[PDB]
Amino acid sequence: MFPCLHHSQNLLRAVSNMLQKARQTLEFYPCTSEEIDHEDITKDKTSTVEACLPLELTKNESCLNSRETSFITNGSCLASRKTSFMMALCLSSIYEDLKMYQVEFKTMNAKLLMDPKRQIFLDQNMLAVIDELMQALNFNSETVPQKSSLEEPDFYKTKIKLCILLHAFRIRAVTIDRVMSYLNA
Amino acid sequence: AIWELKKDVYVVELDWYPDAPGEMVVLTCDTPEEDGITWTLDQSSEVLGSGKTLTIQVKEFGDAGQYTCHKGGEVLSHSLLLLHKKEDGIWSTDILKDQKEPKNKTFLRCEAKNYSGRFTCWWLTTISTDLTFSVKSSRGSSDPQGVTCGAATLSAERVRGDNKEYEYSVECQEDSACPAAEESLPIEVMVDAVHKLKYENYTSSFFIRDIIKPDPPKNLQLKPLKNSRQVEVSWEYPDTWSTPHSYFSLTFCVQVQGKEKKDRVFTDKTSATVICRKNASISVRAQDRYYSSSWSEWASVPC
Amino acid sequence: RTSECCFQDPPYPDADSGSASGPRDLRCYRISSDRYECSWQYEGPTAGVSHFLRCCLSSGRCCYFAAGSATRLQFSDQAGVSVLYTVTLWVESWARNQTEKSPEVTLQLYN
Amino acid sequence: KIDACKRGDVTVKPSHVILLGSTVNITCSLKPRQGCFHYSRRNKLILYKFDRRINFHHGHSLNSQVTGLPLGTTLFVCKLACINSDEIQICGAEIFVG
Ligand SMILES: *[C@@H]1O[C@H](CO)[C@@H](O[C@@H]2O[C@H](CO)[C@@H](O[C@@H]3O[C@H](CO)[C@@H](O)[C@H](O)[C@@H]3O)[C@H](O)[C@H]2NC(C)=O)[C@H](O)[C@H]1NC(C)=O
Ligand SMILES: *[C@@H]1O[C@H](CO)[C@@H](O)[C@H](O)[C@H]1NC(C)=O
């Protein structure tokens, strides 16, 4: 049993439940996988797409581009002398992916609360799981400050952006789960 | 408009309504200049036009065919003509048939069995002869020579109704050397169906994970527990499925209904224990554990 | 020549009207975007009756289809018959060594 | 920057928040680069309130003046219908009458 793998399995399950709630709440807003384009915020910033691979799959090492964002932050998920750099860079990039998403999700939630009704709001449990996993991934975890606005934003745009992020995040959550399973075995 | 599908082949786009005027079509020959070039459409020596240039509006299919560039008694060049009918401003779709299983207007159905990127696409067409297909593929549009599609082959000749639909399939492998954990661009496959003087094209966009269909579970065996009614059943991962088996995982659903309505049990473990009625079979199915995928064929061992 | 119209003149030497019994009710309809069907009824029956659908394009290059004891034929856009412009269609049957002609009908054929 | 609205942008006059009784000018505008791939006089630019058709203009610029809006939120979504392809949602506005 791997504790980070348990957190990652909790993350994928939490996103799956939130995604189901989002489809039910926003009946008109189009939130089916077919009608929602895949857009990834972390497209160029992080190297999870390349660094997070089984050791057998990655060989030439040429594609790792000049140790891109090679922070290699030390953390409680692995041990400093336990695994190869290929997994050390991957764990740092996964921490960065969760930081980029959590900062955005909190911004969306703060705008959603202002709605006169409560049609939809991001799951507090899902946000807590993202923070718990980041704390294990990197010791120098930064907790996002409470975000708020002094004005009211258009709600339709936030609800379309929300659906686009949730689906992309779910794909990211499976990718983290596969890496955690590989680390355990 | 007039565009060249390939050298010596020119597809002409024509509107399809009664009493329609044809587009002015100009024929040119890339040969050393000859005074007196003659032009034929049919194999017959009826001569259509003289000069290195021939003008003929393609008002109907009869006016489309292999115009021949011949002078001096030697055929200088060749000018095959292909037609892309457009009806009410909508491109015709007659060569292939609408399966409709995913949704309406679906003529291409693709599938995969591994994360390697090897995939096969099946299209059902009811035209028995004079049929040719051109297949090209790429990841998004950025990858040049991204995918190496193979050549169409007839696969089956079933008798649905009396039409006898024939199924043609292509084998395509992602030729990208760099391994990547997640796909950001959908693979796009284009089939340029050609029949006689009629040209049609079909485009399908998809992701490998969505089209993946696992092969049936391997080495299924039943081992009765000593002095107990229940029987332990053990199965193994398919060799064809991508490795390592830790990063890529499958979920096994076991149904014991054989021949009470639903004995299906979903077990991640490779061995599950089920009471075996003497008069039934035990069957196992495989699906991608991580994402929703097409279910595998049932693997049945007599019990 | 194979399931497609032949522009060459029909083999039988004389098309002279043969007898009171004649093919009738020749009618052509569009089964599908690229499928069509023409139906004709012969008044007088024969064991060896042979049915031919002879048409003529606007150009005047009359051509004859080949059929064997059938009241119906199905053809596609490229049989040779024009499916956008005007096109006449008529039926001739050689039974008893006399060729009778169904009344000629001109139909757009796109409907 | 994830963008919810790409094909086109929709504006509301004076604002999404209006006093009970006021009339909003929902105007759906399509960017020139985006549009129906094949020009045809069959494609339309519909505007829907709760998926109910209120207007339809062939041209990229669509203008509407909804009136007598009740207290609550009304989702006006402006979809593009092409000749044979299915409707693609382009952009929408949520109006809170207060
Ligand atoms: C699928 O079939 C359609 C039907 O022809 C193809 O669209 C046509 O594509 C050709 C090739 O690009 C166009 O011809 C040439 O286009 C270039 C670029 O615009 C231009 O420089 C040439 O002068 C000529 O126009 C043709 O215009 C276009 N037809 C229409 C109505 O847009 C399409 O390419 C086919 N796709 C595949 C994958 O085969
Ligand atoms: C709405 O627009 C129309 C025409 O564009 C204009 O005549 C009218 O004054 C406008 N009303 C408001 C409230 O903006």
Swiss-Prot record, chain A:
GO BP term (any one): positive regulation of smooth muscle cell apoptotic process
**Disulfide bond annotation, renumbered to this chain:** C4-C77, C31-C163, C52-C90
One molecular function GO term is: interleukin-12 beta subunit binding
Q: Name the UniProt key words of this record, in alphabetical order.
A: Cytokine, Disulfide bond, Glycoprotein, Growth factor, Host-virus interaction, Secreted, Signal
Record localization: Secreted
The induction field says: (Microbial infection) By pathogenic organisms, including Gram- positive and Gram-negative bacteria, parasites, viruses, and fungi. Down-regulated in response to enterovirus 71 (EV71) infection.
Positions of glycan attachment: N60, N74
The question of whether Heme is a record keyword is answered with no
Q: In terms of domain of life, where is this protein from?
A: Eukaryota
| The keyword NADP appears for this protein | no
Q: Name one GO cellular component term.
A: interleukin-12 complex
What family does the database annotate? Belongs to the IL-6 superfamily.
Q: How does it assemble?
A: Heterodimer with IL12B; disulfide-linked. This heterodimer is known as interleukin IL-12. Heterodimer with EBI3/IL27B; not disulfide-linked. This heterodimer is known as interleukin IL-35. Interacts with NBR1; this interaction promotes IL-12 secretion.
What does the UniProt record say this protein does? Heterodimerizes with IL12B to form the IL-12 cytokine or with EBI3/IL27B to form the IL-35 cytokine. IL-12 is primarily produced by professional antigen-presenting cells (APCs) such as B-cells and dendritic cells (DCs) as well as macrophages and granulocytes and regulates T-cell and natural killer-cell responses, induces the production of interferon-gamma (IFN-gamma), favors the differentiation of T-helper 1 (Th1) cells and is an important link between innate resistance and adaptive immunity.
- Gene behind the chain: IL12A
UniProtKB/Swiss-Prot annotation, chain B:
- Post-translational events: Known to be C-mannosylated in the recombinant protein; it is not yet known for sure if the wild-type protein is also modified.
Q: What's a single GO MF annotation on this record?
A: identical protein binding
**Principal location listed in the UniProt entry:** secreted
- The organism's place on the tree of life at top rank: Eukaryota
Q: Does the keyword Transmembrane apply?
A: no
Q: Which of UniProt's keywords are assigned here?
A: Cytokine, Disulfide bond, Glycoprotein, Immunoglobulin domain, Secreted, Signal
Q: Where in the cell is it found?
A: Secreted
Q: Which Pfam families match?
A: IL12p40_C
Q: Which residues form the Ig-like C2-type domain?
A: 2-85
Instruction: Report the GO terms under cellular component.
Output: cell surface; cytosol; endoplasmic reticulum lumen; extracellular region; extracellular space; interleukin-12 complex; interleukin-23 complex; late endosome lumen
Residues annotated as glycosylated: N114, N201, W295
The Fibronectin type-III domain covers which part of the protein? Answer: 216-303
Q: List the disulfide bonds.
A: C29-C69, C110-C121, C149-C172, C276-C303
Q: Which disease is it linked to?
A: Immunodeficiency 29: A form of Mendelian susceptibility to mycobacterial disease, a rare condition caused by impairment of interferon-gamma mediated immunity. It is characterized by predisposition to illness caused by moderately virulent mycobacterial species, such as Bacillus Calmette-Guerin (BCG) vaccine, environmental non-tuberculous mycobacteria, and by the more virulent Mycobacterium tuberculosis.
Subunit architecture: Heterodimer with IL12A; disulfide-linked. The heterodimer is known as interleukin IL-12. Heterodimer with IL23A; disulfide-linked. The heterodimer is known as interleukin IL-23. Also secreted as a monomer. Interacts with NBR1; this interaction promotes IL-12 secretion.
- What does the sequence similarity comment in the record state about its family? Belongs to the IL-12B family.
Under which name does UniProt file this protein? Interleukin-12 subunit beta
Organism whose genome encodes this protein: Homo sapiens (Human)
Gene coding for it: IL12B
Swiss-Prot record, chain C:
Q: List the disulfide bonds.
A: C28-C38
Entry-listed glycosylation sites: N97
**Fibronectin type-III domain location, by residue?**
22-111
Subcellular location(s) of the protein = Membrane
Q: What is known of its domains?
A: The WSXWS motif appears to be necessary for proper protein folding and thereby efficient intracellular transport and cell-surface receptor binding.
Q: Which disease is it linked to?
A: Immunodeficiency 30: A form of Mendelian susceptibility to mycobacterial disease, a rare condition caused by impairment of interferon-gamma mediated immunity. It is characterized by predisposition to illness caused by moderately virulent mycobacterial species, such as Bacillus Calmette-Guerin (BCG) vaccine, environmental non-tuberculous mycobacteria, and by the more virulent Mycobacterium tuberculosis.
Q: What does this protein do?
A: Functions as an interleukin receptor which binds interleukin-12 with low affinity and is involved in IL12 transduction. Associated with IL12RB2 it forms a functional, high affinity receptor for IL12. Also associates with IL23R to form the interleukin-23 receptor which functions in IL23 signal transduction probably through activation of the Jak-Stat signaling cascade.
Q: How does it assemble?
A: Dimer or oligomer; disulfide-linked. Interacts with IL12RB2 to form the high affinity IL12 receptor. Heterodimer with IL23R; in presence of IL23. The heterodimer forms the IL23 receptor.
User: Member of which family?
Assistant: Belongs to the type I cytokine receptor family. Type 2 subfamily.
Question: What is the name attached to this protein's record?
Answer: Interleukin-12 receptor subunit beta-1
Curated annotation (Swiss-Prot), chain D:
- Record PTM text: On IL12 binding, phosphorylated on C-terminal tyrosine residues by JAK2.
- The protein's recorded glycosylation sites are N25
Q: What induces it?
A: In vitro, up-regulated by IFN-alpha.
Q: In which tissues is it expressed?
A: Isoform 2 is expressed at similar levels in both naive and activated T-cells.
Subcellular localization(s) per the UniProt record: Membrane
Cited function? Receptor for interleukin-12. This subunit is the signaling component coupling to the JAK2/STAT4 pathway. Promotes the proliferation of T-cells as well as NK cells. Induces the promotion of T-cells towards the Th1 phenotype by strongly enhancing IFN-gamma production.
Similarity comment: family membership: Belongs to the type I cytokine receptor family. Type 2 subfamily.
Domain notes per entry: The WSXWS motif appears to be necessary for proper protein folding and thereby efficient intracellular transport and cell-surface receptor binding. The box 1 motif is required for JAK interaction and/or activation.
Q: What interactions and quaternary structure are annotated?
A: Heterodimer/heterooligomer; disulfide-linked. The functional high affinity IL12 receptor is composed of I12RB1 and IL12RB2. Il12RB2 binds JAK2 (via its N-terminal) through a membrane-proximal region of the cytoplasmic domain. Interaction, in vitro and in vivo, with SOCS3 (via its SH2 domain) inhibits the STAT4-mediated activation. Binds STAT4 through a membrane-distal C-terminal region.
Q: What is this protein called?
A: Interleukin-12 receptor subunit beta-2
